[PDB]
Design a binder for this molecule. Sequence first.
Ligand SMILES: [C-]#[N+][C@@H]1[C@@H]2c3c([nH]c4ccccc34)C(C)(C)[C@H]2CC[C@@]1(C)CC
Ligand SMILES: O=C(O)CCC(=O)C(=O)O
Ligand SMILES: [Cl-]
Ligand SMILES: [Fe+2]
Length: 280
Amino acid sequence: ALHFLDINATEVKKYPTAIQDIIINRSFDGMIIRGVFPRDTMEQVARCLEEGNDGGMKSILNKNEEFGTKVAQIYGHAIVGQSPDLKDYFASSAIFRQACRTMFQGSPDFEEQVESIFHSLSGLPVEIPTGPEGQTYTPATIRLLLEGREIAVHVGNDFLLMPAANHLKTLLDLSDQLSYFIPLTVPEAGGELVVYSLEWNPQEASKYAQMQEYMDDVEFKIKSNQSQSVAYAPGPGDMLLFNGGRYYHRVSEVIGNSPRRTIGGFLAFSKQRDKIYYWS
Ligand SMILES: [C-]#[N+][C@@H]1[C@@H]2c3c([nH]c4ccccc34)C(C)(C)[C@H]2CC[C@@]1(C)CC
Ligand SMILES: O=C(O)CCC(=O)C(=O)O
Ligand SMILES: [Cl-]
Ligand SMILES: [Fe+2]
């Protein structure tokens, strides 16, 4: 039901309004972009993490043990669930950027390459957002899914309703936010991005007595009947760029000894629509 383009990284400049067309015009819902990073680069970065020679990335690993099976471990603080002051977020974000820059060894640089893609798909300048007093946001977090683990169903636009987003809302236009991620390592089986046709609907959610009741309905609505879905398994160095702000989605259980490792985040238009911000 959902329409995705499947293109190679070298063809991106032939789609100079792809981000506009996904968010504003809504003519299609996502993109696989093949070979944004070389496989050598992906394996180099995977080894750094595995070895511990990771530019200090393991010093900002959040295991999320208090939460259950339905959640990845995350290198760097994800903005989702943070307090609106973002002090811990800004500290870990500064560490992430430096550590990630070192691991990629400018071959190519993660930030430069990801920004190159987003520029090519929009014709606009691209920036990592900056805090109230100049503090850097993080462009991405690295998500680690071990065997048996998954990422529970969720929708991206709920972020706008969180305290964490109070600063970003001053900078962002309130159109849909996209999700992006590149696998560093893929598992033997499972760990697929499942995108459903069930859409974000805060109007419906407020009619319930609380969000607890609304997500319980959404969960039973999605498993498994009244919603079409599509699954994706990008390879190492492929970007999956899609409207996760609008569409409910999840990552299926990882099967096998090899963990799923992705580097990713989100993007959206600036208030003025003359710029793209990306972050995690
Ligand atoms: C995993 N993960 C992220 C989100 C996340 C969730 N629950 C968490 C609990 C504690 C820390 C993070 C999360 C949900 C299921 C909303 C996850 C959505 C996607 C993330 C990888 C990043 C925003
Ligand atoms: O696999 C990942 O890194 C995140 C998947 C996801 O929920 C998203 O891209 O929004
Ligand atoms: Cl999302
Ligand atoms: Fe998501």
